[PDB]
């Protein structure tokens, strides 16, 4: 029966951070190059998911309660030709909001300057994993990457960038993943090749056959 007036909204519902110099410098190169062997994105993203699973396994051996949110350690590949998106879900340790921002937005600067300098010495984009910046190879076939993430010491937040030199961080109000990292790739229009059931099967068998975690394809 009274009149409401929101004096203060609180925390910003979308925080626009800016990549480091080298990081945004590489993301543009990865988008612009005409690299044919661009299937490594699935090797690097899966490999990075395996690293998140090793972490949640490590800390669980001294604390089983860290698996109260998720018992199984899996890697899911979810194609979606409708929204032209290929989702990659791993039930790893995930990231905190502070960790999510920093990992993808700052510390990549180290191996990024090294990877580009290596490219000046005749290195291949295939060798991007050796630098730990293998995540950004996902822009070989994507024009937009969205990362959903949940941790056992924070809430669920979303990471979004189209390599404009900046990325946005917002509290993800949607499907609860429980724990881990959910990398939603918005594929380029000419890269729906990796959205076909058959195509995904070979890349997993050709590259990431060293993974010690079950790779399920929901196609």
d(C-alpha 123, C-alpha 121), whole Å: 6
Rounded to whole angstroms, the Cα distance separating 183 from 199 reads 19
Between the two ends of the chain, the Cα-to-Cα distance in Å is: 53
Q: Is 118 exposed, middle or buried (0-12, 13-18, 19+ CB in 10 A)?
A: middle
Q: CB–CB of 181/75 below 8 Å? A: no
Residue 78, SS3 per DSSP:
strand
41 annotated as belonging to a binding site for a ligand: no
Label the pairing between strands 142-150 and 85-90: unpaired
DSSP assignment of 87-144 equals: EEEE-S----HHHHHHHHHTTTHHHHHHHHHHHTTT--GGGGGGGT-GGGGGGGTEEE
Strand 142-150 versus strand 15-18 pairing type: unpaired
179: which 2 tokens?
């724990």
C-alpha angle with apex 176: 172 to 180, nearest 5 degrees? 90
- Is 32 annotated to bind a ligand? Reply is no
For residue 101, how many C-alpha atoms fall within 13 Å in the half-sphere facing its CB?
12
Q: What approach was used to elucidate this structure?
A: X-ray
- 135 annotated as belonging to a binding site for a ligand: yes
Q: Is 109 annotated as a binding residue?
A: yes
Q: What domains are there in the chain, each with its CATH number?
A: 1-219 (3.30.565.10)
């Amino acid at each position: 029966s009274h009149m409401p007036e929101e004096v203060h909204h609180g925390e910003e519902e979308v925080e626009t951070f800016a990549f480091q110099a080298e990081i945004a410098q590489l993301m543009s190169l990865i988008i612009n190059t005409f690299y044919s062997n661009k299937e490594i994105f699935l090797r690097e993203l899966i490999s990075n998911a395996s690293d998140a699973l090793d972490k949640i396994r490590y800390e669980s051996l001294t604390d089983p309660s860290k698996l109260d949110s998720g018992k199984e350690l899996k890697i899911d590949i979810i194609p979606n030709p409708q929204e032209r998106t290929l989702t990659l879900v791993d039930t790893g340790i995930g990231m905190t909001k502070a960790d999510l921002i920093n990992n993808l937005g700052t510390i990549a600067k180290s191996g990024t300057k090294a990877f580009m300098e290596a490219l000046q010495a005749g290195a291949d984009i295939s060798m991007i994993g050796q630098f730990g910046v293998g995540f950004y190879s996902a822009y070989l076939v994507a024009e937009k990457v969205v990362v959903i993430t949940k941790h056992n010491d924070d809430e669920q937040y979303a990471w979004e960038s189209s390599a404009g030199g900046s990325f946005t961080v917002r509290a993800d109000h949607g499907e609860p993943i429980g724990r881990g990292t959910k990398v939603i790739l918005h594929l380029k229009e000419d890269q729906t090749e990796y959205l076909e059931e058959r195509r995904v099967k070979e890349v997993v068998k050709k590259h990431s056959q060293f993974i010690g975690y079950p790779i399920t394809l929901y196609l």
